[model samples]
Target chain A: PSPIEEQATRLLKEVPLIDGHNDFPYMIRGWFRNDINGQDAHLYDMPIGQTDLQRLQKGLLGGQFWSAFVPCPKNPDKEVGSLEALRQTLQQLDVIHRLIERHPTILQFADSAASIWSSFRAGRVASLIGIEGLHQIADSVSALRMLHRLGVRYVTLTHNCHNAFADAATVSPELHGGLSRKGERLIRELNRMGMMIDLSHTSHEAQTQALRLSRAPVIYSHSSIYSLRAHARNVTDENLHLLHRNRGVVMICFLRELLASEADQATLAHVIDHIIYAGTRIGYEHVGIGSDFDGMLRGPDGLHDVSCYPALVAGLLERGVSEEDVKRVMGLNVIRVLEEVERVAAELQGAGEECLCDELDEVWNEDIKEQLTRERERVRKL
Target chain B: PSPIEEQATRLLKEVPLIDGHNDFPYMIRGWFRNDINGQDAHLYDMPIGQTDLQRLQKGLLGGQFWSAFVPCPKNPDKEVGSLEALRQTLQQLDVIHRLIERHPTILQFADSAASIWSSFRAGRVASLIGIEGLHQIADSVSALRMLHRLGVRYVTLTHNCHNAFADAATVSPELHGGLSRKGERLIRELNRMGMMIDLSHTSHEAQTQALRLSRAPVIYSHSSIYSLRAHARNVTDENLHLLHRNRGVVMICFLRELLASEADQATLAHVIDHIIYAGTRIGYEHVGIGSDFDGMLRGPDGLHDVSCYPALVAGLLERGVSEEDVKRVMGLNVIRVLEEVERVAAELQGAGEECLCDELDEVWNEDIKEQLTRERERVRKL
Candidate 1:
C-alpha cells in the first residue's frame, strides 16, 4: 500500500472526517416524501442517488452534517410558497431525526463539538443538521430559533433564490442590495443562539456583509473558490480574504458546473485543485470538505458517491500536503469553527446580551384605536 | 350594570387576564391558509370564525396562548401522514409568528410569565404559543424542544387521536393506555427544557400519569370539570384530585359539549358554573380560564367571541367569587405555574441533568462492519 494512502486511513480513524454538508435528507424527501418507516432496504441501497447507508459505511465517514434542504418556493404565490417551504423544511428535519434514531449504530445525533467526538468514540457517524436556506425560516426569527433547537447547527442565508434575509448568487434582482435590515439583525440572533451562519449560495455582497457583521465564525458549507471557476456560486478571492480575518472555513464543494465550464471536464483533480487553492490562499486551517453529494445527480470523475471519499483523501495526500494540514482540511477546521461559535455565544450571553428578536411596528392607527375604545365602551354599557 | 361589573372591569385593567388556550391561529388557517398579508379588512371581521381582531380588542384580553394546531393525520399511511402533520405544524407556527409580528400594536410574543406581564404593560396582548398534540412532533423529542424554542410555551400531549406518547380522550381502544415509556422520558425532557406540559385532550389515564410524573406544575389548557359535563374531554373527579395534589390548574374549557349535555343549552352561566365548581373543590389558586375559543365552531351563549370575556368575568364576580380569587382564576394562577416551570428547569439544568435523547439500537451487522473494513483496505491498496 502507498504510504500516503496508509496515512489517510490512519488519520480518518484517529480524528473524524466531518464533512460540512450532505443532502441525503432531501433525497429521502424526493423519493419517499419523508416516510422512512420500513424502508430500510431502500435506505441501505438507494436505487437512484449518490448516498446510501451501505456506501456511507464503506466510505469510512466519521461524521456528516445532513442538509435539511427544501427548494425555494416557485409557486409565484410568494407568501403561500415561502410558507410552504417552511413546512417542507420541518418534514426534512423530522426524517433526519428518524434516520439517525433508526440507525443508531451507524449514526448518532450531535449538536455540539463535544457530542461529535463522543459519537465518533462510540463508533458511529456524528450526524448533525443544517438548513440549506433562510427561506426555510419564512422571515420569522422565532421559526429560526425552532430550527436551531431542532439540532440545525448551520443555516445558509440564501440558496438559489433571493429571500427576505439575503440575496442569492444566481438570482438577478438584487433585493436589499446585499443584506436587508432584517438580514443583519438575523446574523446577530444566529450568533447569539450559537448557530453557524453558512454563506454557500449567498451573493458575494451578502457574504461580505455577513462576514463583517458576524461575531462568531461562519462557514461556506459547500462552495469552491471562484478564482478557480468563475461561477457565482463559488467563493471569490475577495471574500476568501475576509473569511481569514473572520476565522471561518470555506468547505470546498464538488459540483461539476461549479468546478469547470464543461460538466464533462470536471474531475477529482479539479475538486482537489479548488481545495488546494483555498488552502494555499488562506491556509489549510480555513479549508475543509463539503461534498454536495446527493445535491446533484452526477458527481465528478473518481468521486462518484459516499464510497469515493477515501480516494479524495488519498489524492490530497498525494499532492504533497502534510498530514497535519490534511487533517485540518478533512475535519479539524470545521470542528474549530464550531467550537469558536459556541465560545462566542457563551461570552455574549455571559455579558447579558439580549438576543435580537423580530422587528415589528405598530399596525393600529389612532383612528382604529379610538374605534376599538368606543366598541369596548359600548360592550361595557351593554 | 351592577357594582360587581365595575369591579371586574377594574381588575382586568389592573392585572393581565391570560387565557390558557385559544385556537385563533387555526381559524386563520382555515379561513385564509395563513395568508394574512393585506387582509386587515377580513382580520377585523372574519366571515366564519368566532374570533376577529375587533372582538379580541373588545375582550380586553391582556394575554393569550394561541394554539398552533394541525388536525391528527387521517391518511391510512401513518408514516406519510404523521410526517405531513409535522410539516403542517411548522406552517401553523410560522403563521402564528407572522400574526404576532404583523400586529405588534395588538400582539407581542411572550415565552415566560415575566414576558407576559411585560407585553401586557406595553399595552399589547401577550401572545404566546401552545402546540395542541404530540403527533405534531412526529415521535421526535428534538422537534418538541424546537417547538418550545419557537415560543411554544406549552404542549398538549394529545388531541383527539392517539400518539406514540399518550392516548387521546376522543380516541377509543387506547394506544399507550397512559403515558408510555417514551412519554415519561419526554415529560422529563420537557420539564428539563422548561416547557409547560398541557394535559388537555389527553385520555384520563394519560392525564393522571403525566400529572403524577411531572415535577413541574401541569395545566389543562382547555378542559372542563367532568363532574359538571359528564364528557370524555372533561377532567374527571379523580384526575382533578390528582391535579390539585400536583399543584396544577384545571383551566375550564368553554366547549359547549363539555359545558352542557344539550349542545345549544350551554350558556355563559354554565361556563362560569364549571369554573366555580373546580375553584370550590380545589383552591382558587388552582383554577384558571381556558376559553378554547375558535377550537369549536360554537361558544356558550352570550360568550359568542373574545369580546365576551369581560361578561364572563362579571358573571364570576356577581357569583360571590372574591376580587382576588377572580383575579387568580383569570390569569395569576397560570402565571405562577409558568414561573414554577421555569424555576424547576433552572434547578435541574444547574445540577447538570442530562436531557432525554432517543433510544436506538445497533443497525449494522458484524458482517457489514467487516466489509467496511475490507473496503477501506482496498482503497488503501489503490
Candidate 2:
C-alpha cells in the first residue's frame, strides 16, 4: 500500500490531474461577493471554507474548470427573472477572470486541451471556465455565444430550475418533460459554436435527448454512479451507456450525497468505488475526477478538502487500477474529450453551417444606421 | 395666489411640464431588481417611493428624464471595478424600456422635442432617459453612444466619485482637478453624438470646464442655485454665468440639502425661492423644475411626491412668474436645449466630423474572422 501510494504520487507529478468542476470562483462570490480587493490573506487562507489558495497549492492540482455558476432565478414570472441570471453570469465571469489574473503564477487561463497541457508544462494550474446553467444565457443565443467568447468552454444544460431550453432533474417533470423544441434546436447551435454541452443537471429524458443529439462529445462535470446512490443528480446506467456511445466522459463527483447511503459516511473509499465502477464499465478513457470542491461547505469524510486529492489517487491504485488507467481517469480522458469536441466544431464550421443569431439585430433602426453610414462616407471624402 | 394657482394648473394642461430628472426607473430597480412580472399594481402605485401612476396622472406631468442612476463603483482598483457600472446601466435601461412598454397607455417613449409633443398629444407621459453618471459608461465612449442609441439622452459626467473623465462634487479632486484630458476630448464626441452633457453631480471645476467646452448647450439635470444653498451639488454663481453664456438650463433640484440650510424645514416656499433666484440670474428660458423625486426618501414639505408638482407650478405663478415664463420653465427650455443638441449633431455630421469609437474594434482577431468569412463563402457556394 505504501509503494502504491508512492507510485500514485509519482504518477500525479508525471501527468496533469484535471478536475472537471470546482466552485472556488463561486466560493469567492460568497466570501467576497466578487470584491477581492486587498483580501489576499482571506483568499490564500480562507477564514471558513473547504478551499483556499494554500490547500489548492498543497494539493498540487494541475488544472480545474472553475465554475461560473449563478443560481437559478429565485422568482420567474413566465421566465421574466430568467434574464437576471444572465447579468449575474457576467459578474461571476468577471470574478473568475480576476481570480486567474490576480494569481497568474498559480493559475493560467485555458480554453482548450492544448492550453491545459501548456499550462501544466509551464508549472501552472490551467484554469478553464464552465457556466452551470442554460438559464444563464437568458433566452438569448447571442449571450450564449458571448459567453463562449468570454472563455466558457462548457455550459451545463440546467441547474435545479427548468428553463426555456431544458428541464432540470430536481424539478417535477412538467415543463417540456425533457428538452423543449427550443432546447433541442439549441444543441445544434451549441455544437456549431464549439461550446462543450454539459449534461450534468438536466433531467434523464433531456440527458438522453441531448446525448443522442450532440454531434460533439459532452461532459457531466460532476456526477456519481447512479446504481450505487439513487440520487436524481447521479448518472443512470443507461445514460452512462449513451455517454459512452456519444464518446463522452462522466467525470465522477465527490459530492457526499451522490457517493454513499449516508453522506457523512462517504469517505475517500466511497469516492474510489464510484470512480472504479465508472472506469470498469465505460473504460478509464471515459471517466475523470470532478471534485466539486467549494461547491459544498464540507466534503466527504476522508476527502475533507482539496489537499486530500493525493489520498483519492492512492486509494485508486490500492484498488488495483493500473497506472495508465489511473492517469486516464485523472485527466487524460477529459483532455481527449475536449480535443474531440474542438475537432467536431472545426468540421461543422468548415462545412459552413449557418450560425445561430439572437433575435433583434441592432437597437438602432435603419434610419440611424443610414445617418451613421452617410457620416462615415462624408468623413472618408474629406 | 389662488388665481395664480389656477393659471399654473391651466398652463400645465396647455404646455408639457417636463421634469428634467426623475429616479422612477432606479426606484423600480431598488424595489424589484428589474423583475417586473405581475408587478403592474406595484408599478402603478409604488409602496415606498414618491412616484406612482396615480400620482403621476394627478400631477398632469407631461414628460420626464427617467434617470438611469447606478451608484458609483463600491470599490475600484486602479479603477478596475468601474466596468461593473456599465453592465448595470444596461440593466437599468432594460427596466426603463419595460416600464414604458408595459404601460403604453400611461407612458410613451420620446427622444426628440417632436416626440415629447407626440407623447403629450397621445395623452401619455413622455418618457425620455438619462444616465446619472459617467461612471456608468465605464470609460468606453462606444458604450456611451450605444446608451444614446438605447434612448439615453443625457449623461451626467460624475455622480459622487471622480472617474477617468471628470471629477465629482463630493470626492476630493485628487484624480483630476476637473476634467481630465480624456474628459476634455470626450466633450467633442459628446456633442457630435448629440449626448446632452449633464453637470448634475460634477465638481465646480468640471462643470466650469464642461459648460465652456461643450459646442452644444449642456444641462444641469438636477442642480440647484449654489448662491442660495452653498452646497457642492449646486451650481455656483460663476458657473451659472458660464451656463447662461453657454445657453444651458440649470434645472433646479428639490433635494432639501440643495434647497435650504435645514433639509427638514425646507418647504414649497424654499423651492419657489431657488427657482426665482435661478430665473432672475439666468433668463426664464434657462431654468427648469428637476424634482429629483424618488432620488431621495422624502421630498421637501409641500412638494412631497409626484402629486405635488402642481404646487411647484402654482408657487412659481404665485411668486409673480408670468404664465409664458412659467410655461417655458416647465418644459419649453429643456425642449429647446434638446432641439439645439439635435441641430448641433446635424451640423457636425454634415461637416464630416469623425465619430468616437471604443479603443478596440472587435474582440475576435483577423485569424478567427478569416475563417468566419471563408465559412460564409463556402455556405454561399453550397
Candidate 3:
C-alpha cells in the first residue's frame, strides 16, 4: 500500500486476501529442534519471524496454501529413495494433524471457501497444502494415487529443474524441450482427476500449457515480477496481467529482487512496493503475500525478520493502505483463490463415481489376465 | 534484544539459531490447498487456525524436526488407527517434500548434525523428521525397521495416551502400570537401531523408568514447569533439574498458562521470560526453544504469531539474557543433544550385536539350526 496510498489502503482491506504459497515446514525445520508432539506451539517460536504462528495472529492471514515440498533427486540410482521421499512427505503431513489436534479450540482444517469464511470469523487460520513437485511420486501413478488418498490436494508439475514430466525455468537441451508425453498425460490426468496445476517454478511454456490444460485455476505458490528485476524465477509483467484474466491471485512474494532492484537493496519496506504494484497491475483481488521466508537465504532489510512484519503493516498503513485492504493482502485474497480451487476439485471428485480399483494385477500371463477380468467384474458389481 | 538488549541484539546477529519442532505439515493441510500427486489432502478439514508456510517465513526459522504425530486412543474398545494414520502420514510427508522440492534455494534436507550445520551456514532451512508416538508402527518391530529405513531418525514411545508398548501420563492400571515389557524391548530396539527416544509426554513413573532404561539420552522436545501450571502435561521442578543432571536439555515450551502467566499474555515477551526462567531454573546450558509453532492453540498474547520470535529476543534483552546464551537456546543445544543421542545409539547398536543369539539351534528350528551348524563347520574347514 503505497504510491497513491489512500486508495491502495482501501483496496487492501476489501480484497479478502489469500496467499498462494508458503513453506513453514521448511522454515520451522530450519530453526527448531522439536516436532509436532513438542510443547504447545505459537507463543515461544512465532515471536520473531515474518511467518510464525504469532505473525499470523498479529497480521491478517485468512487462509494459506501450504507447500508440501519434495527434494530434487539426491539418490537417483536408488529407486527406494522415491519411497523415502514419499515417506518424508507423509511425515510432513502429520505436522498438519498435530497442529489441529493440539489446538482444536483455535485451529481447524478448511476444505472449501465457505468453510474458510467460517474459519476466519472464528479467528482461526485455515490450512491446506499443495505438492510443489511431481518427482515425489517416484514415476509411479500408483504412488500418486496413494498421495491423493493421503489428502494432498494439488501438485505443481515441476520445480527448479525439469523432471520426467515437465520443464523448469532453466534451459537444458534434453529436459528443457517441453512437457514430455508423460507430462502431458499428467496434466490431463490431473485435470480429469480435478487437481489444480501450480505454475510456480515451471518455464513460461510449461506454465502456459499447464494453464491451458488444467481444468482448475493454476497458482504460483511464491513468484514475483520479472519486470522489476528480470529474474528467471519470476513471472513477467504481461503474465501478471494474464493471472488476473485467469482469475488467479498472485501471492506477493517476499524476495527483495522480485519487487524492485532499488527497493530490493533497501529493506522490508521494499516488499510492500511489490504488493502495491500487484494491486495496481492486477485487481486488488488478484494480489496477496507469500513471503518465501525460510526458503530465502537472506530476507530484505526492513522485512529483515519475521517480527518486523507488523512494522511492514504499520508502514503500509502509513503509506495509506486501508485497514481492510491490509487485512486482505495479509491473507483474504489467497483464501478466495483456495476456496475456488477447492470447489472445482471437490465438484470434480463428487461428479466422478468412487473409482476404487479392484485388486491390482500386472498384465503378465493368461491366468493373471483371467484373474483380473474376474476381479474387475466383481468390483463392477460392487 | 530488550532486557539484556544491547548484548542479545549483538548475539542474534552472530548465532545461526534454529529450533527442532514444528507441525508445518498439519498447518499446510488445514490452511492451504495441497495437492500430493494430483489429489487433495482433505483429512480433518476443520477451519481452525494455526501454522502455515507464509507464517513460517516470517518466523525466520532455519532447521526443524518435522514430526509425524499419531493421536492417542479415547474409547476402551477402540483400536489404534495405525493403517489410516500411516496412510495420512505418508501423504503429509509427500507434502513436505513438495515444499522443499518446490523451493530448494530456501530449503534442504539434512541427515546429520554436521549437514544441518552446513545447511544453516548455506542460508537454507535444514529439514529432518521424527516419528512421534510409536503406536503407528502397529506393534511390529519389522514396521519399526521399515520406518527407520524410510529415514525416520527418532521415535517417541508414547504420546499423551498409552500404547501397546507403554503407559502414558494417566498412570491408570493398564499394561504394567507404567512401562510395559514390550515398551522396554521397543526402546532397546530403537536404541540398537540408532534412533532417539522422545520423552515429552511421559508420566513421572514412566519418565523415571525411561531415563534409566534407554541407552541413549532421552529428549523432552517441549514441556514446561509443573511447579507453575501444576498440570499433568507440565514437568515438575525436580524433573526440570533432572533433565540437566541426566545430560539432556529441556526445550522450553510456549503454552500461555504453562509458562509465566503474569507476564505479557500472548506475546513474545512472555515466552522470553519462560526461556529465561527455564535457563536460570534448570541451567542455561540445558535451555532451548522448541516453539511447537503451528501445533498448539492459545499462544501467548504477543507471541501468538510465527513472525514475532525476534521480539522474544528483544524481550530477553529487556531483562538480562546474554547473546551467547540466546544462541545456545535458539539452536546449538538441541544439536548437541542430537549428537549425543546418535553417539549413544551407535554404542548401543554395537552392544546389541554381542547379545544377539545368532545360532539358530539356540532359539529353535532344529533342522534349520543343524544346517546352520553344518555350514559353520564347513566354513571353518575352509
Candidate of highest lDDT: 1
i-RMS, every candidate? 11.0, 20.6, 20.9
Clashes of each: 0, 0, 151
Indicate the DockQ of the complex predicted as candidate 3. 0.01
Better of 2 and 3 by TM-score: 2
| Candidate 1 whole-model C-alpha lDDT, 0 to 1 | 0.84
Model 2 chain B poorest 10 in a row by lDDT: B356-365
Give the alpha carbon lDDT tens digit for every residue of A250-298 in model 2.
9989898888888778878888888889888888899999888867645
Query: lDDT values of the candidates?
Result: 0.84, 0.82, 0.61
Instruction: Give the RMSD in angstroms, all C-alphas superposed, for model 3.
Output: 24.7
Docking class of 3: incorrect
Query: How far does residue B182 in candidate 2 sit from its true spot (Å)?
Result: 17
lDDT of 3: 0.61
In terms of TM-score, the best-performing candidate is 1
Error of 3 at A181 (Å): 2.7
Provide the clash count, candidate 1.
Answer: 0
Best by DockQ: 1
Q: Model 2, range B118-231, lDDT digits (tens) per residue?
A: 999998999999998888876766456656767899988888878889888887735888899999999999998788889988888888888889999999889888887889
| Model 1 lDDT at residue A44 | 92
Among residues 3 or more apart in sequence or in different chains, the pairs in candidate 2 whose N, CA or C atoms overlap within 3 Å are none
